[PDB]
């Protein structure tokens, strides 16, 4: 079960071809993996641990390149209970000598697992440890995505082991990057970035830097989640893409997303649709009852604008368009252009509410929001076609620099 | 199709059986029904229209009784599109000589339809029309649900005609509120109120204070949705309920909603609905993934104590609480006991937010958010019991005057 990377380094885990409900925040509509790496040497060591209801397939995995009772190092990455998970078994079956964690790992092991007596040693970064043979690399990267975060290096193999960081929601036969089509692996690598390590762009290009600052250009880059980066090129796609990530830079991409109850904030959006079309921008419509806020981020995190609908209920928003905004502000995207609308019948508070959601994302908002009683007319067709020139205009005008 | 109600009055329209998200904002589990009532008199007269859709079923169901062209007289009493969508399709089968509207009903029936030549006519809270041997009384129903909403009454008959008030969504073989199980009557005219009527409780006591001030003391109530209110007994339940749903008085019951993505808060949750019960309280733990924000609603609508978890995602709270929040916040819920709970990592936000949500809603807060980092103990859940204790003590005192 176990699947050989090079000598002595082994991808051992489990493959979740079901995962829809990816951590009750985001979607995985390909399912995704648990990967765990098994390194032979003097000290045999283990890094990262999988969900714990796959410890079975782990120590089955393990134990088919090595006796589990043989493995001397733990090395735990992250404390998110999808990698941390079987840490509790691996010690019991493994009996560690030492469990290596980051100082807040160490932290943070304690707050999930509330432990008695776990012979954990905390690194820091930089540090480097003797496996033996090979020796080991540890690097921090706080808040990427979590403050317990650090990753693994293996300068003379060019192994880089980056707990989710890389990490993509791909189930799959296939293990490593190169037997994947680049459009998929790219598409799942970004929908994973957009939805948990976006607002944390700044730590993203820092940690980057500082690591290509030390000698970081693997062959090998070996996430949690999803397919290992096999490579020098592979892996410098990676983190290109990375760099481009965080960087968010504006697309001729529209996104604009709404909710309705009687059709009128949907009739707004069709036409906002296609007078964005007409000033040359790519459009994606996205409907709120049938798009997973996690994919309206994916497709907003490289659009130059995202647009907003929702009628007026009850004083303010429809839930759908309120959760989706709560969510996107989380991510925090940069670098966007806002727009909104809707239709009221009396009170009207829909357009002055989500003016202040966008703008309090930073979003740029240089056309006023168009509102309409009820149904819409003629005339509010050709008010919704202006806000759209105004916008694409401004959008026009930032993508030239 | 048509279905007698009384001799000259006959229910038409359209039963929606597979209705289920009823008109974007709630769920109709049971379908609902679009009922338009035709009365026959020398200047025959229909009532409402129905959904767009519906208006084949509904031509189909007049003709039953009567040549359409022969009707004079349109009283169209709410202007959303389940009652006046067949409006433009009626006005073209039946060339009616007056179309009869209130006057918020008028205003309301330009901005949807934007007509030109059409016979309006406003009618005045109080007043009074001839249909022939007929003589029917017009009563002004401000936001209930919409600024337009009137009613009808048929003083010698004791009929009355009273748009979306009173109705239910409940699609069946069965037309008469004697006819199907209280039961079942019941929750459905709850779960009805709680969703769209509910922020207009006052104006609800207050028109039931004139109806009754007035003489309507009804034999029949004609609804839009659902079943008719046959025999004064049924009319008397239906007013005695609305003016106890509009009235909302605790009881010993605890709604508890909460999302998670680690199961903490969930735990946390799951210990909170125990204690409760251990108070003597009866609990709805409610998770956001599995129940429509209109559940939520419907099982707070007669709750004393709402309690609320999140763990904190990204500097807040996950979206479908938020969603869920934003949905209640908008039905405005008196006389409750909020609470809060919720799992964080680092900056913690989720309880905070979550407090000021509640506070905002006007619900007392005798006891101090529960937050735990991570994984919850034993002390955590003394802290949570604690808790339940503080708040069913003051739910307790409430329920003795
Ligand atoms: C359940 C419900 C709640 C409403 N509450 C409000 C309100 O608070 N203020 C408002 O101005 N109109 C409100 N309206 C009216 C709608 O905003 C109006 O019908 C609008 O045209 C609906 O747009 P849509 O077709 O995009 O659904 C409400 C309508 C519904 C059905
Ligand atoms: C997607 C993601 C985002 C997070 N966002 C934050 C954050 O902004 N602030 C924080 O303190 N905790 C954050 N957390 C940590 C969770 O709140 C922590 O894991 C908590 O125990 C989750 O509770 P739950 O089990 O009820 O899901 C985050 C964790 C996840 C997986």
Known sequence: QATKIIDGFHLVGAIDWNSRDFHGYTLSPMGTTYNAYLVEDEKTTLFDTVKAEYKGELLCGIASVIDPKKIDYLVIQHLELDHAGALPALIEACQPEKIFTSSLGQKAMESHF???????????????????????????????????????????????????????????????????PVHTLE?????????????????????????????????????????????????????????????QKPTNKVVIFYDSMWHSTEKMARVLAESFRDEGCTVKLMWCKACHHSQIMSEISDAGAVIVGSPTHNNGILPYVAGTLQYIKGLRPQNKIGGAFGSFGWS??????????????????????????????????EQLKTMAQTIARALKAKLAA
Chains 1, 2 share one sequence.
Request: proline share 6%.
């Open 348 to 381: 009207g508070e829909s357009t002055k509410v989500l003016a202040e959601w966008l703008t309090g994302m930073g979003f740029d908002m240089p056309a006023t929001p168009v509102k309409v009683k009820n149904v819409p007319t003629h005339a509010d067709y």
């Open 187 to 247: 598409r799942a690598m970004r929908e994973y970035y957009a939805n948990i390590v976006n607002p944390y762009a700044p730590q993203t290009l820092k940690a980057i830097e500082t690591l290509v600052g030390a000698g970081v250009a693997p062959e090998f880059i070996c996430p949690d989640h999803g397919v290992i980066f096999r490579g020098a090129d592979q892996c410098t796609f990676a983190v290109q893409k990375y760099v481009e990530y965080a960087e």
């Open 114 to 180: 509330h432990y008695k007596d776990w012979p954990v040693q905390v690194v820091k970064h930089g540090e480097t440890l003797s496996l033996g043979k090979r020796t080991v690399t540890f690097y921090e990267t706080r808040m990427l995505h979590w403050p317990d975060s650090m990753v693994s290096w293996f300068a003379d193999e060019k192994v880089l082991i980056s707990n989710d960081i890389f990490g993509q929601n791909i189930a799959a036969s296939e293990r490593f990057s190169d037997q994947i």
